[PDB]
């Protein structure tokens, strides 16, 4: 019953740090819509000694304008209190992430056998206000067996404390740490490693290149690789050197480790271990998780102006970048900016072979040869009005246009 399905591969880097994370970036979150909701259901497919076991979670209705972190409302085949192991979080710009605590089994299995269970894939079901059913299939490229417990308490003994608190927004950590080294930028080899500890989770991040080697005046950007399931946005770091006495050499170190889950808990600890070679230094700081809604959940848009005369106006919807002619399914939807009734405002939907639905008022749509979609509006008044048009194809990228119609 999926109109459009998207495939993705989940890669595990190094080890499971205590939570599983998967990103779904292609579901539509329409702009200028307070009343736009989505029905989301998620199935996790587990392999248990070669036998397959499904786990269905119900996440109710997403309300992006009022809520950004969702706990499943009901589970089928789950172990008791399992619903507690899952979170659904909106990340902004039309994306969301699904998280599972991975140190407790979410399915009851025999103690004697089935002790090692592996996650095989995750299926995500998404139905928008137009009634279109979106599906995402994410397959575990390199899975490991889920190992319950294995959570020793870890603390580092000699690390200078910092009153700086690192805040996490939409799973992303952002902190800047002033520091001092005896080495000038020219004669410095800089390296840094981090560790984040809290609750049941232990994340390690390193520079895969080892060290910056020669440090340059100004900004020195570099990648960092963290243990766990990797986000499509890479984690990063920047070492900034001041411009050229007996005083030391000042630097600012900014770190942005990307997949950081609030399952760590408020007041978990970020450890930063760095070294400047011409020794060793360790800084520790607390980490807190913002509860603020991103308020930018809308998917990216393309805004364009159309000037008309009279009370009729036309607009041509181009093919999607990845879409080609003869694409098996093409869907185009449209609604006026800031609707207020879900029962009537979202009736204009066209497939390749459907025509204009009876419930669509003062808008006509038809596919021309070369697959350009032509929209006609016949009731435009004198005041400007904004039209939101969304087009998708089977293996292509969903694209949304904001079209402003203005009288000449």
């Amino acid at each position, epitope marked *: 019953v999926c109109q459009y399905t998207i495939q993705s591969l989940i890669h595990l880097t190094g080890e499971d740090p205590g939570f599983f994370n998967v990103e779904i970036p292609e579901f539509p979150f329409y702009p200028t819509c307070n009343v736009c909701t989505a029905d989301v259901n998620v199935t996790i497919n587990f392999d248990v000694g070669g036998k397959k076991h499904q786990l269905d979670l119900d996440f109710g209705q997403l309300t992006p304008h009022t809520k950004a972190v969702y706990q499943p409302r009901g589970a089928f085949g789950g172990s008791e209190n399992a619903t507690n192991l899952f979170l659904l979080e909106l990340l902004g710009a039309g994306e969301l992430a699904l998280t599972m605590r991975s140190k407790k089994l979410p399915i009851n299995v025999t103690t004697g056998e089935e002790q090692q269970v592996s996650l095989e894939s995750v299926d995500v079901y998404f139905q928008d206000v137009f009634g279109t059913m979106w599906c995402h299939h994410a397959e575990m490229q390199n899975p490991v067996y889920l190992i319950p417990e294995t959570v020793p308490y870890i603390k580092w003994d000699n690390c200078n404390s910092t009153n700086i608190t690192a805040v996490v927004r939409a799973q992303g950590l952002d902190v800047t740490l002033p520091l001092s080294l005896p080495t000038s930028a020219q004669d410095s080899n800089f390296s840094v490693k981090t560790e984040m500890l809290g609750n049941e989770i232990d994340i*390690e991040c390193i*520079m895969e290149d*080892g060290e910056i080697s020669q440090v340059l005046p100004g900004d020195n950007k570099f990648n960092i690789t963290c243990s766990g399931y990797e986000s499509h946005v890479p984690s990063g770091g920047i070492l900034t050197s001041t411009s050229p006495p007996g005083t030391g050499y000042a630097y600012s170190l900014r770190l942005t480790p990307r997949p950081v889950s609030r399952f760590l808990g408020n007041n978990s600890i970020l450890y930063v271990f760095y070294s400047g070679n011409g020794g*060793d230094y*360790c800084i520790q700081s607390n980490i807190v998780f913002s509860d603020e809604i991103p308020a930018s959940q809308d998917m990216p848009t393309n805004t364009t102006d159309i000037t008309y005369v009279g009370d009729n106006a036309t607009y041509s919807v181009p093919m999607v970048t990845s879409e080609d002619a003869n694409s098996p399914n093409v869907t185009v939807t449209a609604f006026w900016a800031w609707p207020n009734n879900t029962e009537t405002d979202f009736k204009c939907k066209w497939t390749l072979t459907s025509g204009t639905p009876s419930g669509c008022e003062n808008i006509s749509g038809a596919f021309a040869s070369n697959r350009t979609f032509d929209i006609t509006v016949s009731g435009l008044g004198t005041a400007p009005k904004t039209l939101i048009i969304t087009r998708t194809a089977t293996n292509a990228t969903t694209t949304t246009h904001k079209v402003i119609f203005s009288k000449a």
Partner: antibody, heavy 120, light 111 residues
């Protein structure tokens, strides 16, 4: 380029303490882990342990844990391994190495190895 | 020496592909992605061919590849050359900052 050099006594009397040091050149201890590996003549490899996080992490082979001590002397670019209560089962070539990557899983640079013989 | 399980020896002809298995448990090989493979020539220190299951250090040819399925890791050498004659060891993380090595496999190039 990083170069490592083990140095030991050659012969250790039974029940005495085996003391080895690795000297680092062309590099620094920095944020890496630093590990010891050993290989009895004609046999396979065995992981002894490693030291990391600026000496904050001391992790040893659980079968040798109570006889093993690792230490680092950054001012001499050396780190060391001590093995107590030695027997002929500890006769082996000992390697020091740099362990990099997450958890130090990647032993990318090795010393040439030093043979230590336990004999009365 | 507590160890992972490898066959004592494998053999191949020049130009052939040879695969070496390494069997662990859900607590070491199937529980992490920290499998390494080492090449050791007589009288020399081991040299890493593969780390993190399938990643190759700079300088080692792509004739060497690693994979994993379940608790079994495999090293494959294609385009076998007489230079490839050596002992091969697997290693894996085993939790709590510990590592286990395989017993080693002696590779013979025939002909």
């Amino acid at each position: 380029q990083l170069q490592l050099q083990e140095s030991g006594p050659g012969v250790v009397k039974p029940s005495e303490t085996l003391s080895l040091t690795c000297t680092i050149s062309g590099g620094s201890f920095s944020t890496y882990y630093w590990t010891w590996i050993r290989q009895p003549p004609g046999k396979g490899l065995e992981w002894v342990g490693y030291i990391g996080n600026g000496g904050r992490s001391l992790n040893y082979n659980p079968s040798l844990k109570s006889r093993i001590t690792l230490s680092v002397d950054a001012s001499k670019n050396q780190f060391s391994l001590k093995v107590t209560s030695v027997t002929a089962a500890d006769t082996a070539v000992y390697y020091c190495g740099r362990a990099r990557g997450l958890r130090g899983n990647w032993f990318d640079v090795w010393g040439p190895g030093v043979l230590v013989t336990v004999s009365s | 020496q507590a160890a992972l399980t490898q066959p004592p020896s494998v053999s191949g002809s020049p130009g052939q592909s040879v695969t070496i298995s390494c069997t662990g448990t859900s607590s070491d090989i199937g529980g992490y992605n920290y499998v390494s493979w080492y090449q050791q020539h007589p009288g020399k220190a081991p040299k890493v061919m593969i780390y993190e299951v399938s990643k190759r250090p700079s300088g080692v040819s792509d004739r060497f590849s690693g994979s994993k399925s379940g608790n079994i890791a495999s090293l494959t050498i294609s385009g076998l050359q007489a230079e490839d004659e050596a002992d091969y060891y697997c290693s894996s993380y085993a939790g709590s900052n510990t590592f286990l090595f395989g017993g080693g496999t002696r590779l013979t190039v025939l002909g």
